[PDB]
Design an enzyme around this catalytic site. Structure first.
Site, PDB file in Angstrom:
ATOM      1  N   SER A 243      52.288 -69.883  34.371  1.00  0.00           N
ATOM      2  CA  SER A 243      50.704 -70.391  33.830  1.00  0.00           C
ATOM      3  C   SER A 243      50.967 -71.554  32.887  1.00  0.00           C
ATOM      4  CB  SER A 243      49.877 -69.325  33.695  1.00  0.00           C
ATOM      5  OG  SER A 243      50.024 -68.451  32.560  1.00  0.00           O
ATOM      6  N   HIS A 273      53.543 -62.987  38.797  1.00  0.00           N
ATOM      7  CA  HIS A 273      52.944 -63.569  37.760  1.00  0.00           C
ATOM      8  C   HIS A 273      51.876 -62.574  36.956  1.00  0.00           C
ATOM      9  CE1 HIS A 273      52.494 -65.832  33.958  1.00  0.00           C
ATOM     10  NE2 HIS A 273      51.860 -66.833  34.470  1.00  0.00           N
ATOM     11  N   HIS A 316      61.431 -58.855  34.048  1.00  0.00           N
ATOM     12  CA  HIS A 316      61.087 -59.951  33.405  1.00  0.00           C
ATOM     13  C   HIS A 316      61.880 -61.287  33.577  1.00  0.00           C
ATOM     14  CE1 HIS A 316      59.322 -62.400  30.474  1.00  0.00           C
ATOM     15  NE2 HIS A 316      58.063 -62.050  30.665  1.00  0.00           N
ATOM     16  N   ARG A 325      54.611 -55.795  24.114  1.00  0.00           N
ATOM     17  CA  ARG A 325      53.141 -55.795  24.413  1.00  0.00           C
ATOM     18  C   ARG A 325      53.048 -54.600  25.108  1.00  0.00           C
ATOM     19  NH1 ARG A 325      52.627 -61.316  27.735  1.00  0.00           N
ATOM     20  NH2 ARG A 325      54.757 -60.477  28.670  1.00  0.00           N
ATOM     21  N   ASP A 371      52.095 -55.982  31.924  1.00  0.00           N
ATOM     22  CA  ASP A 371      51.254 -55.816  33.131  1.00  0.00           C
ATOM     23  C   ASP A 371      51.378 -54.459  33.616  1.00  0.00           C
ATOM     24  OD1 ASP A 371      51.782 -58.933  34.848  1.00  0.00           O
ATOM     25  OD2 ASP A 371      50.389 -58.468  33.210  1.00  0.00           O
ATOM     26  N   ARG A 397      44.809 -66.136  28.048  1.00  0.00           N
ATOM     27  CA  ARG A 397      45.865 -67.124  28.336  1.00  0.00           C
ATOM     28  C   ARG A 397      45.535 -68.541  28.159  1.00  0.00           C
ATOM     29  NH1 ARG A 397      51.148 -66.422  29.947  1.00  0.00           N
ATOM     30  NH2 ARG A 397      50.862 -64.783  28.577  1.00  0.00           N
ATOM     31  N   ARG A 417      58.923 -84.791  34.578  1.00  0.00           N
ATOM     32  CA  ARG A 417      59.326 -85.463  35.648  1.00  0.00           C
ATOM     33  C   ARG A 417      60.737 -85.333  35.781  1.00  0.00           C
ATOM     34  NH1 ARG A 417      61.513 -86.856  40.364  1.00  0.00           N
ATOM     35  NH2 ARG A 417      60.079 -87.760  41.761  1.00  0.00           N
TER      36      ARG A 417
HETATM   37  C1  LIG Z   1      59.071 -60.654  36.804  1.00  0.00           C
HETATM   38  C2  LIG Z   1      60.201 -60.980  37.896  1.00  0.00           C
HETATM   39  C3  LIG Z   1      59.686 -61.952  38.713  1.00  0.00           C
HETATM   40  C4  LIG Z   1      61.441 -61.625  37.340  1.00  0.00           C
HETATM   41  O1  LIG Z   1      62.070 -62.262  38.313  1.00  0.00           O
HETATM   42  P1  LIG Z   1      63.723 -62.697  38.001  1.00  0.00           P
HETATM   43  O2  LIG Z   1      63.727 -62.999  36.556  1.00  0.00           O
HETATM   44  O3  LIG Z   1      64.074 -63.569  39.382  1.00  0.00           O
HETATM   45  O4  LIG Z   1      64.148 -61.299  38.364  1.00  0.00           O
HETATM   46  P2  LIG Z   1      65.814 -60.615  38.202  1.00  0.00           P
HETATM   47  O5  LIG Z   1      66.720 -61.760  37.492  1.00  0.00           O
HETATM   48  O6  LIG Z   1      65.856 -59.514  37.744  1.00  0.00           O
HETATM   49  O7  LIG Z   1      65.982 -60.667  39.901  1.00  0.00           O
HETATM   50  C5  LIG Z   1      67.252 -60.176  40.181  1.00  0.00           C
HETATM   51  C6  LIG Z   1      66.664 -59.327  41.584  1.00  0.00           C
HETATM   52  O8  LIG Z   1      66.134 -58.294  41.187  1.00  0.00           O
HETATM   53  C7  LIG Z   1      64.951 -58.298  41.659  1.00  0.00           C
HETATM   54  N1  LIG Z   1      63.885 -57.307  40.794  1.00  0.00           N
HETATM   55  C8  LIG Z   1      63.461 -57.745  39.733  1.00  0.00           C
HETATM   56  N2  LIG Z   1      62.526 -57.089  39.271  1.00  0.00           N
HETATM   57  C9  LIG Z   1      62.136 -56.346  40.342  1.00  0.00           C
HETATM   58  C10 LIG Z   1      61.172 -55.376  40.525  1.00  0.00           C
HETATM   59  N3  LIG Z   1      60.123 -55.130  39.357  1.00  0.00           N
HETATM   60  N4  LIG Z   1      60.976 -54.622  41.589  1.00  0.00           N
HETATM   61  C11 LIG Z   1      61.940 -54.621  42.560  1.00  0.00           C
HETATM   62  N5  LIG Z   1      62.981 -55.809  42.405  1.00  0.00           N
HETATM   63  C12 LIG Z   1      62.946 -56.333  41.461  1.00  0.00           C
HETATM   64  C13 LIG Z   1      64.575 -59.408  42.258  1.00  0.00           C
HETATM   65  O9  LIG Z   1      63.573 -59.408  42.935  1.00  0.00           O
HETATM   66  C14 LIG Z   1      65.822 -60.051  42.467  1.00  0.00           C
HETATM   67  O10 LIG Z   1      65.991 -59.593  44.033  1.00  0.00           O
HETATM   68  P3  LIG Z   1      66.573 -60.656  45.242  1.00  0.00           P
HETATM   69  O11 LIG Z   1      68.133 -61.010  44.227  1.00  0.00           O
HETATM   70  O12 LIG Z   1      66.797 -59.917  46.458  1.00  0.00           O
HETATM   71  O13 LIG Z   1      65.712 -61.667  45.041  1.00  0.00           O
HETATM   72  C15 LIG Z   1      60.794 -59.906  38.387  1.00  0.00           C
HETATM   73  O14 LIG Z   1      61.120 -58.784  37.477  1.00  0.00           O
HETATM   74  C16 LIG Z   1      59.629 -58.872  39.537  1.00  0.00           C
HETATM   75  O15 LIG Z   1      59.385 -59.434  40.697  1.00  0.00           O
HETATM   76  N6  LIG Z   1      58.621 -58.085  38.875  1.00  0.00           N
HETATM   77  C17 LIG Z   1      57.562 -57.566  39.562  1.00  0.00           C
HETATM   78  C18 LIG Z   1      56.454 -58.553  39.295  1.00  0.00           C
HETATM   79  C19 LIG Z   1      56.047 -58.493  37.987  1.00  0.00           C
HETATM   80  O16 LIG Z   1      55.763 -57.161  37.180  1.00  0.00           O
HETATM   81  N7  LIG Z   1      55.532 -59.442  37.514  1.00  0.00           N
HETATM   82  C20 LIG Z   1      55.120 -59.710  36.049  1.00  0.00           C
HETATM   83  C21 LIG Z   1      55.976 -60.416  35.115  1.00  0.00           C
HETATM   84  S1  LIG Z   1      55.701 -60.527  33.327  1.00  0.00           S
HETATM   85  C22 LIG Z   1      54.036 -60.403  33.066  1.00  0.00           C
HETATM   86  C23 LIG Z   1      53.192 -61.393  33.853  1.00  0.00           C
HETATM   87  O17 LIG Z   1      53.783 -62.443  34.147  1.00  0.00           O
HETATM   88  O18 LIG Z   1      51.717 -61.084  34.452  1.00  0.00           O
END
Ligand SMILES: CC(C)(COP(=O)(O)OP(=O)(O)OC[C@H]1O[C@@H](n2cnc3c(N)ncnc32)[C@H](O)[C@@H]1OP(=O)(O)O)[C@@H](O)C(=O)NCCC(=O)NCCSCC(=O)O
Ligand SMILES: CC(C)(COP(=O)(O)OP(=O)(O)OC[C@H]1O[C@@H](n2cnc3c(N)ncnc32)[C@H](O)[C@@H]1OP(=O)(O)O)[C@@H](O)C(=O)NCCC(=O)NCCSCC(=O)O
Lengths: 429, 429
Positions: A243, A273, A316, A325, A371, A397, A417
Site C-alpha cells: 500500500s 495485504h 510477514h 501490533r 491482521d 493507512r 523507475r
Molecule cells: C505476508 C506474506 C505474503 C509474506 O510473504 P513472503 O515474505 O513471500 O513469505 P515467506 O518468505 O515466508 O514465504 C515462503 C513460503 O512460505 C509460504 N507462507 C508464508 N506465509 C504463509 C501463511 N500464512 N500461510 C501459508 N503459507 C505461508 C509462502 O506462501 C511461500 O510459499 P511458496 O514458497 O510455495 O510460495 C505471507 O506470510 C502470507 O501469505 N501470509 C498470509 C496473508 C497475510 O496474513 N497477509 C498479511 C501480511 S501483514 C499485515 C497486512 O499486510 O495487512
C-alpha cells in the site's frame, strides 16, 4: 506572536532537511548499501533496500517505530481523548513532524480535520448508486479517485507552479483527504449495512475517531477507544509495504494525493495485504462452522495448507517475530473482552498455528501479524460485517502514507523507475 | 484434432518455463546482479535492476523489444488488417506467447475480444452520472475498479482455489478486461464530447481497433490505421515504468486484474508519466497562442525551464537516445500528414528542444519520448480533446501489463515488498 499551524512548522523544517540530505549525499551517494541477487529479483525485492521513507522504520525483530517511537511508547506519550488510547491526530503530527505533539497541537488537527470534511455531490451520488455486491474496498477506491475533481495539487500543476512549492499543495490535498475519508468510509457503511439511514454531520468539537464512530452509528464508549487505537496502530508500516509503496510510486509521477491513495487502496485490497483483515474472520467463521480440541484445530490448519491456500494473519515479508501490533491488540482484549469466545479461539490459534507453520517448513516468519487480531475486536463490539474491515485499515493507512507523500515532494524525490530484466536477459547477464 | 486457443497454448508453455527458471535459480540465485548505492535510494531506484518482467525489455540505446522484436520488426512481422499497420491483437499474442502469431491466431483474439466486451449495468450507470469536470483518466480508473464486481479471479480466490491455478483465472479476467476497455473508453468519450449519442454495438467481425474507432465515432479509414499502430506501440515498455510496475506491485498482493490495472491507471495519469500525452498538446497549444522563429521558440522553452517546469515529451528515465516510438510516429506523419502545421512545429522542436536541454545541463536524456509525438497525430484526424489522450495510452498499456500479469501468477512471483530506510537510518548504516 500567534497560534498553531502545521504548515508553518513544516516550512521551517523542509530547508533544514533538504540541506542535511544534500550534504550526506555529497559525501555518501556513491556508497554501496547493498547488493542485488537473482533470487531477490525473482523474489519480490525481498531483502532489497530500495526506498527512502521517513516516517517509520520496521525492525524485523522489534517491530515498527514511528520516530524512533515504539508502539508502547506512543501509547504512553501521545495525547489521549481524556481517555486511555492515543489520538491518531497526535500520531499524524508525530509522523509529519518527528516530534511529540502537545494536547494543544492535537486539538488543532482535530478541528482542522473537522473543518475540511466535506463531500462533493458527484461522489455522494456515485456511492448512493453503487450495487451492494461491489466490495467496500472497490467502492472506497473508486470514490477517492473520483474526489480528484477537487485536487488542489492537480489544479496548481495545471497552472504551472514551480516544482518547489509542490509540497504545499500536497499538504493541503493530504489534510482535505484525511478529513473526508471517514465520511466516505461511513457513507459506504450506512449504505450497505444500514440502508435508509444518514451519516449525519461532523461536530467540530469531537476528535476524528469519535466523529467517525458517530457516523458509523456506534455509541459504545469503549468502541470509540478501540477506534482510536486501531486507527493509530494501522498508521504506517514503513515504505516497502504494498500500500505505501504503491502510493509512493504513483505519487512519484506527480499524480495528486487522491489518485495515489486510491491506487494504494487497490493494493491494500489484495488477500496477501490488508484484505487479510477480512480473510481472518471468514476463516475463523468457517472454522467454527466445521469449542474444539487443539488436535481438530490442527487438522483444520493442515487442510488449508494442503489445499494450496495460506493461513491468513500469520507470516510477514519483513517481521520475524510476533507483531507488536498483535500484542497491542491482545492486550486490549485481555482488558476488555477477555471472555469472548472469538478472542479465546484467536488465543488458542496462537498456541497452534506457528507450530504448524514451523512443522510445514515454508513460512520464514511463523508468527501472527496485525491482521490476525483486529477483526476479533470489531465483532465484539457488533461490527460484524467482515468484508468491511479493510476499509478501516484503509482509513488509518492514509495517515502514514500521506504524511510521507508530503515529504517526498518537499524533498524533491524523483520518478520511481527501476530497471527490469527478463529471464532470457538475466540468463544472458 | 481441433482449433485455436491461447489458453491451451499457455498450458503447454507454463511448466516449461517454470522448470527453466527453477534450475537457473538453483544454480544462480546467489549471484550478484548489482549493487545499491545511496544515490539510487534517493533517486527512484534509478539504474537499480529490481524486477523480472518478461514481455519486453528496454535497451537504453536501441529502445524497446517485444520478444527480441523491435518496433520495425513488429511492423513487418505482425499481421495487418488487410492494411499496413500491425494489429494490436497480434502484438498481444506475441507478448503472451513469445511467438509471432499467424493471421489465423490473430483473428481468434479479435473474435474473443469481441465476444467478451460487455458492460454491466452499474458501470454504465456511474459513467453516465459522472460530472464533466472529472478527468477522463479518473473516470476510467474508477470504472475499472468498479468492474471488479465481475472478477473471475476475485471469485475463485474467495472459493479457495489452489494457488497453482491462479494464472488461469487471471487469464480470463485479462481477456475480459481487454475486451471491455474500448467500451468503457468510448463511453467516456461519447459522454463528455458527444453528449446524447451512443457507443453502439461491437461487431464480431471487426478487429478490436476498428470496433474502438467506430465506438469513438471516427470514419476515416486512415484514422483506423493510426489507431492500430498507436495501440500496438504503446503496448508495453518493460516492467520498471510507473504504470506497469504499479500493476505488478498491486497484482503481487493478489488483487484481481481489474484492481491492479486501475491502480496502474492512476500512475499513468501523473504528468511525468502518460499524462505527458496531454501536456505536450497543451504546451504546444499555449506556444502557438503566445509560424515562429527558432529564436522565439527558444525563448519559450527557456521561460518553461526557468519557471520550475518540465518540457513535456522530452527526456526519459531509461532511454538515452531518441525513442524509436517517436521515430515510428514521425514516419507515420511524413507519410500521411506531412503539411500539418502542428506536425511541422513538432518537427521544428526536435531541432531546438534537445539543444536547449543540453545547454541547461540537467536532463540526462535530452531526446524526445513517445509522448512528444502522439497527440499531433490525433489532432490531425479531428480528435482534438487533449485531456482525453492518456485514455488511449491507457487502453494500449492494458496489453502489456496484463500479458505480464498472467505470467507473474503462472510463475508464482511472490509479494513485492522491499525494505525501506529513513534518512537517519541510512546516515547510521
Ligand atoms: C505476508 C506474506 C505474503 C509474506 O510473504 P513472503 O515474505 O513471500 O513469505 P515467506 O518468505 O515466508 O514465504 C515462503 C513460503 O512460505 C509460504 N507462507 C508464508 N506465509 C504463509 C501463511 N500464512 N500461510 C501459508 N503459507 C505461508 C509462502 O506462501 C511461500 O510459499 P511458496 O514458497 O510455495 O510460495 C505471507 O506470510 C502470507 O501469505 N501470509 C498470509 C496473508 C497475510 O496474513 N497477509 C498479511 C501480511 S501483514 C499485515 C497486512 O499486510 O495487512
Ligand atoms: C521522464 C522524466 C521524469 C525522467 O526523469 P529522470 O530520469 O529523473 O530525469 P533525469 O535523470 O534527466 O533528471 C535530471 C534532472 O533533469 C530534469 N529534467 C529531465 N527531463 C526534463 C524535461 N523534459 N524538462 C525539464 N527538465 C527535465 C529533471 O527534472 C531533473 O531535474 P532536478 O535534478 O531539479 O529534479 C523526465 O525526463 C521528465 O520529467 N520529462 C518530462 C515529462 C515527460 O515527458 N514524461 C514522459 C516520460 S516517457 C513516456 C511516458 O512515460 O508516458
Amino acid at each position: 506572536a500567534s497560534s498553531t499551524n502545521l504548515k508553518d512548522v513544516l516550512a521551517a523544517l523542509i530547508p533544514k532537511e533538504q540541506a542535511r540530505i544534500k550534504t550526506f549525499r555529497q559525501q555518501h551517494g556513491g556508497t554501496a548499501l547493498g547488493q542485488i541477487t537473482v533470487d531477490m529479483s525473482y523474489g519480490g525485492m525481498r531483502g532489497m533496500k530500495g526506498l527512502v521513507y521517513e516516517t517509520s522504520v520496521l525492525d524485523p525483530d522489534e517491530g515498527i517505530r514511528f520516530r524512533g517511537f515504539s508502539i508502547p511508547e506512543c501509547q504512553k506519550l501521545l495525547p489521549k481523548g481524556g481517555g486511555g488510547e492515543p489520538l491518531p491526530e497526535g500520531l499524524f503530527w508525530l509522523l509529519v513532524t518527528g516530534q511529540i505533539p502537545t494536547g494543544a497541537q492535537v486539538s488543532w488537527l482535530s478541528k482542522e480535520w473537522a473543518k475540511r470534511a466535506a463531500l462533493p455531490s458527484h461522489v455522494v451520488t456515485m456511492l448512493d448508486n453503487f450495487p451492494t455486491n461491489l466490495h467496500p474496498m472497490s467502492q472506497l477506491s473508486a470514490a477517492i479517485t473520483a474526489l480528484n475533481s477537487e485536487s488542489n495539487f492537480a489544479r496548481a500543476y495545471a497552472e504551472g507552479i514551480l516544482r518547489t512549492k509542490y509540497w504545499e499543495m500536497v499538504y493541503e490535498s493530504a489534510m482535505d483527504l484525511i478529513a473526508k475519508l471517514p465520511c466516505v468510509a461511513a457513507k459506504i457503511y450506512r449504505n450497505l449495512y444500514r440502508a435508509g439511514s444518514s451519516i449525519g454531520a461532523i461536530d467540530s468539537k469531537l476528535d476524528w475517531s469519535h466523529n467517525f464512530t458517530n457516523m458509523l452509528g456506534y455509541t459504545d464508549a469503549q468502541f470509540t477507544e478501540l477506534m482510536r487505537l486501531y486507527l493509530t496502530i494501522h498508521s504506517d508500516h514503513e515504505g516497502g509495504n504494498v500500500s505505501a509503496h504503491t502510493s509512493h510510486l504513483v505519487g512519484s509521477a506527480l499524480s495528486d494525493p487522491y489518485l495515489s491513495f486510491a491506487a494504494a487502496m487497490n493494493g491494500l485490497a489484495g488477500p496477501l495485504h490488508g484484505l487479510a483483515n477480512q480473510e481472518v474472520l471468514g476463516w475463523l467463521a468457517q472454522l467454527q462452522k466445521a469449542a474444539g480440541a487443539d488436535a481438530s484445530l490442527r487438522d483444520y490448519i493442515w487442510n488449508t495448507l494442503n489445499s494450496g491456500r495460506v493461513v491468513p494473519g500469520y507470516g510477514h515479508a519483513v517481521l520475524r517475530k510476533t507483531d507488536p501490533r498483535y500484542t497491542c491488540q491482545r492486550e486490549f482484549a485481555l482488558k476488555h473482552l477477555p471472555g469472548d469466545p472469538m478472542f479465546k479461539l484467536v488465543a488458542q490459534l496462537y498456541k497452534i498455528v506457528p507450530n504448524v507453520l514451523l512443522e510445514q517448513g515454508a513460512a520464514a516468519n511463523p508468527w501472527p501479524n496485525v491482521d490476525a487480531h483486529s477483526g476479533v475486536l470489531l465483532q465484539y463490539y457488533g461490527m460484524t460485517e467482515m468484508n468491511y474491515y479493510t476499509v478501516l485499515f484503509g482509513v488509518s493507512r492514509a495517515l502514514g502514507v500521506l504524511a510521507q507523500l508530503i515529504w517526498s515532494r518537499a524533498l524533491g524525490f524523483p520518478l520511481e523507475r527501476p530497471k527490469s530484466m527478463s529471464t532470457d536477459g538475466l540468463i544472458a547477464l
